[PDB]
Amino acid sequence: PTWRVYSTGSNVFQTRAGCLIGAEYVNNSYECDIPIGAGICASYQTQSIIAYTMSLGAENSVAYSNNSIAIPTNFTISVTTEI
Amino acid sequence: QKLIANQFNSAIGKIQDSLSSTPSALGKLQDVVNHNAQALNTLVKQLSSKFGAISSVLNDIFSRLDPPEAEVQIDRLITGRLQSLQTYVTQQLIRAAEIRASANLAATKMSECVLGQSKRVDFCGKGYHLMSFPQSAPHGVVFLHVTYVPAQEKNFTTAPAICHDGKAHFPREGVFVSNGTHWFVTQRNFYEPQIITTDNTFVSGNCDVVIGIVNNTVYDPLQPELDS
Amino acid sequence: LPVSMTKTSVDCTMYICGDSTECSNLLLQYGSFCTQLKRALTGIAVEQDKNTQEVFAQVKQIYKTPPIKYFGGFNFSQILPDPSKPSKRSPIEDLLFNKVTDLICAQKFKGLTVLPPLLTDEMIAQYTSALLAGTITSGWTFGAGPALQIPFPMQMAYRFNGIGVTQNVLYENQKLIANQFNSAIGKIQDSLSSTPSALGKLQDVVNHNAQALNTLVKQLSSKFGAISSVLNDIFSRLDPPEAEVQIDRLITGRLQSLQTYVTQQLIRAAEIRASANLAATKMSECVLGQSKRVDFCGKGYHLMSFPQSAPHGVVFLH
Ligand SMILES: *[C@@H]1O[C@H](CO)[C@@H](O[C@@H]2O[C@H](CO)[C@@H](O)[C@H](O)[C@H]2NC(C)=O)[C@H](O)[C@H]1NC(C)=O
Numbered sequence: 148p149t150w151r152v153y154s155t156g157s158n159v160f161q162t163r164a165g166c167l168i169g170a171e172y173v174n175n176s177y178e179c180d181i182p183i184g185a186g187i188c189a190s191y192q193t194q195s196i197i198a199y200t201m202s203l204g205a206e207n208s209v210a211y212s213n214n215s216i217a218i219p220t221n222f223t224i225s226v227t228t229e230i
Numbered sequence: 231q232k233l234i235a236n237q238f239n240s241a242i243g244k245i246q247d248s249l250s251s252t253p254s255a256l257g258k259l260q261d262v263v264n265h266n267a268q269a270l271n272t273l274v275k276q277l278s279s280k281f282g283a284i285s286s287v288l289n290d291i292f293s294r295l296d297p298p299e300a301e302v303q304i305d306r307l308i309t310g311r312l313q314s315l316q317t318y319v320t321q322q323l324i325r326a327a328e329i330r331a332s333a334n335l336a337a338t339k340m341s342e343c344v345l346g347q348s349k350r351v352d353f354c355g356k357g358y359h360l361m362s363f364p365q366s367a368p369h370g371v372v373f374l375h376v377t378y379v380p381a382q383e384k385n386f387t388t389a390p391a392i393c394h395d396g397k398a399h400f401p402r403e404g405v406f407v408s409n410g411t412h413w414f415v416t417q418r419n420f421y422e423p424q425i426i427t428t429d430n431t432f433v434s435g436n437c438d439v440v441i442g443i444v445n446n447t448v449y450d451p452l453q454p455e456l457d458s
Numbered sequence: 459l460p461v462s463m464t465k466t467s468v469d470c471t472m473y474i475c476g477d478s479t480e481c482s483n484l485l486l487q488y489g490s491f492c493t494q495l496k497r498a499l500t501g502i503a504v505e506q507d508k509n510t511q512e513v514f515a516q517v518k519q520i521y522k523t524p525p526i527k528y529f530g531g532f533n534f535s536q537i538l539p540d541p542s543k544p545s546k547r548s549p550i551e552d553l554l555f556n557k558v559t560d561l562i563c564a565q566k567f568k569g570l571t572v573l574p575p576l577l578t579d580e581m582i583a584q585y586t587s588a589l590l591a592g593t594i595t596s597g598w599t600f601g602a603g604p605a606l607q608i609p610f611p612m613q614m615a616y617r618f619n620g621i622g623v624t625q626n627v628l629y630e631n632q633k634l635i636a637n638q639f640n641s642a643i644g645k646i647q648d649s650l651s652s653t654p655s656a657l658g659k660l661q662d663v664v665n666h667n668a669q670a671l672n673t674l675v676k677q678l679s680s681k682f683g684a685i686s687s688v689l690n691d692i693f694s695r696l697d698p699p700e701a702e703v704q705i706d707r708l709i710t711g712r713l714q715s716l717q718t719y720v721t722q723q724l725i726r727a728a729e730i731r732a733s734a735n736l737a738a739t740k741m742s743e744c745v746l747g748q749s750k751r752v753d754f755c756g757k758g759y760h761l762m763s764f765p766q767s768a769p770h771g772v773v774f775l776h
């Protein structure tokens with residue numbers, strides 16, 4: 148239809164899924180909000196729509212050692228629901 | 231006991247709030263309702279299609295046309311509507327198969343999580359399963375899984391065996407640990423150190439095959455009282 | 459085990475009517491068929507994303523193996539990621555992606571297109587390495603709470619206790635057990651490379667989707683009782699009065715071809731979903747713990763398992 152995107156000064160981004168017009172590509176990484184495809188997600192963040200690469204999770208590194216062990220000293224009772 | 235009863239009750243009190251505040255917590259059950267209504271609206275709404283005919287009204291076709299030319303016009307309508315019902319019934323059979331699979335899983339979870347204690351990982355909750363409670367929901371069921379989760383871990387130095395009198399001792403149901411100066415034997419899932427005696431350890435072999443053995447003393451309960 | 463299948467998208471208007479504007483007007487009065495087909499195919503496409511997320515996103519953190527790789531004598535080199543390769547795939551993983559594998563441009567011009575998966579191969583390989591690193595440095599503890607480290611030989615002593623063998627058997631046979639494991643891992647690589655039909659369960663997934671699309675394309679040369687199988691020919695040869703009884707056969711006939719394809723696609727997605735459900739359960743019970751169920755995690759007495767990523771599926775080493 149008659150509607151047009153500016154295609155200039157609108158922060159055109161190139162993805163493996165296609166051409167995304169109207170969203171700025173940041174270099175940060177957030178949890179997926181709106182799946183675009185090929186590892187790209189989109190979200191509404193501060194008054195604009197931004198596109199990023201989704202992050203699998205928080206980085207961690209178990210301190211593996213040669214003769215070292217870790218033992219808990221407390222516990223928690225957790226109740227979760229399944230539908 | 232008193233602390234454990236408190237933790238359980240606080241956990242229960244948050245479930246009443248969690249489902250109430252979160253809107254899409256029951257999205258799975260609302261999907262059953264929506265798909266059924268959307269199919270029936272599509273079946274009803276598909277009655278206005280001409281399917282190539284002059285109109286979508288049978289009475290108008292018969293009153294305005296001669297019989298032999300009316301049959302041609304209504305044949306498209308009858309064939310078009312028979313196709314709609316066949317497609318609707320076919321989709322229902324596919325949906326009913328998906329529901330039956332979920333019903334079979336719910337019956338299994340009832341027998342295993344609710345009627346017993348389960349050793350299968352992540353089958354009944356995230357953590358070590360304790361027990362479960364059922365609740366009835368429209369066109370479904372809801373399970374409350376109670377699980378035991380460790381917290382507040384500590385660093386320790388460990389050894390596979392302890393050497394004493396030229397014999398290698400292994401723990402019976404625990405693990406050897408040390409805070410830096412002394413050696414204890416403790417259960418794996420909870421820190422409760424105890425002195426290494428001949429009651430909670432068993433001897434097997436000598437003191438050179440094991441890679442990582444450690445010199446220590448293995449207390450003998452029989453000896454000290456005998457000397458009294 | 460297969461985990462997902464190709465995600466396809468169909469242009470209803472272009473497949474049936476081609477480039478004819480006369481057909482486009484007439485397709486409007488046939489009801490909401492193209493709206494149903496899109497809704498069904500979109501549901502399949504989204505479900506494929508969920509299958510992979512359900513199977514591989516079993517852990518919420520991304521673990522890493524320490525720089526020094528010595529775990530009591532066990533190698534693990536053939537399963538850990540290879541830094542030298544840019545793809546960051548393990549040698550067994552890189553071998554798998556080779557075993558499993560104009561026509562595409564011809565299909566695109568009929569309205570048949572293919573959507574790419576949300577999780578790239580790089581992301582799925584990182585899930586497998588995070589899972590692999592967790593189970594080596596922790597055991598089954600990272601699957602039920604905070605990950606608590608433990609030496610690997612002491613972890614294997616725990617796993618013999620779960621099958622009725624006392625601890626001393628491992629400690630007095632540690633060198634023998636390590637060599638048997640290394641030899642078994644090495645033979646898996648060689649036996650897999652030599653046989654090309656070993657990865658047959660995922661080639662069938664790839665073949666069926668490509669074969670069904672080809673039949674849908676070849677269905678456009680049928681006539682369905684019409685004078686011709688070209689829309690432009692019929693409209694340029696007959697008067698609009700009498701051309702309706704001809705175009706109706708072609709439109710209805712091609713609507714049947716589209717409806718049949720979606721129905722078969724829905725049935726296949728149901729089978730794939732069952733397979734993905736089983737793969738997710740095996741990851742929870744074989745990989746994140748030790749299973750006492752008979753013949754669930756390999757044949758014998760289960761000790762542990764290691765996952766590997768493969769195109770449109772997963773591979774477990776029990
Ligand atoms: C158990 O000991 C290990 C060995 O030092 C600890 O690992 C380091 O802990 C510091 C503390 O902040 C971190 O900065 C390092 O990144 C850790 N090393 C690695 C390789 O991750 C470990 O923290 C100790 N356990 C606890 C609970 O602190």
Ligand SMILES: *[C@@H]1O[C@H](CO)[C@@H](O[C@@H]2O[C@H](CO)[C@@H](O)[C@H](O)[C@H]2NC(C)=O)[C@H](O)[C@H]1NC(C)=O
Pocket residue numbers: 220221222
């Ligand atoms: C294990 O955790 C519990 C709470 O999670 C600790 O109990 C606390 O004890 C202190 C003083 O004894 C009080 O603040 C409360 O009775 C408890 N806290 C709360 C918030 O209820 C318990 O002391 C911990 N045990 C160890 C060994 O650290």
Ligand SMILES: *[C@@H]1O[C@H](CO)[C@@H](O[C@@H]2O[C@H](CO)[C@@H](O)[C@H](O)[C@H]2NC(C)=O)[C@H](O)[C@H]1NC(C)=O
Pocket residue numbers: 409410411412
């Ligand atoms: C390791 O644990 C042992 C046993 O609890 C500790 O030994 C005790 O240390 C306290 C500290 O004042 C003394 O009051 C006790 O008399 C000690 N027990 C005995 C039997 O002598 C030891 O201190 C701990 N190690 C560290 C580094 O705290």
Ligand SMILES: *[C@@H]1O[C@H](CO)[C@@H](O[C@@H]2O[C@H](CO)[C@@H](O)[C@H](O)[C@H]2NC(C)=O)[C@H](O)[C@H]1NC(C)=O
Pocket residue numbers: 213214441442528
């Ligand atoms: C601590 O780690 C070192 C290596 O990082 C281990 O040293 C090896 O021990 C085995 C067992 O006899 C020898 O066969 C190797 O030759 C040693 N060197 C290497 C480079 O592997 C050492 O065993 C570990 N300590 C414990 C208690 O297990």
Ligand SMILES: *[C@@H]1O[C@H](CO)[C@@H](O[C@@H]2O[C@H](CO)[C@@H](O)[C@H](O)[C@H]2NC(C)=O)[C@H](O)[C@H]1NC(C)=O
Pocket residue numbers: 393396445
């Ligand atoms: C644990 O005890 C044994 C004794 O059975 C120690 O072995 C002795 O080590 C000394 C050297 O410090 C040698 O001179 C002896 O000949 C060894 N044998 C005996 C029978 O004493 C062993 O060294 C001890 N462990 C450690 C770490 O020192």
Ligand SMILES: *[C@@H]1O[C@H](CO)[C@@H](O[C@@H]2O[C@H](CO)[C@@H](O)[C@H](O)[C@H]2NC(C)=O)[C@H](O)[C@H]1NC(C)=O
Pocket residue numbers: 533534535536644
């Ligand atoms: C783990 O196994 C791999 C192969 O299964 C070993 O890699 C071999 O290393 C030797 C010496 O560096 C080479 O001659 C071989 O060609 C390597 N094989 C391959 C397939 O590249 C590796 O050495 C083993 N790990 C350890 C610690 O020995």
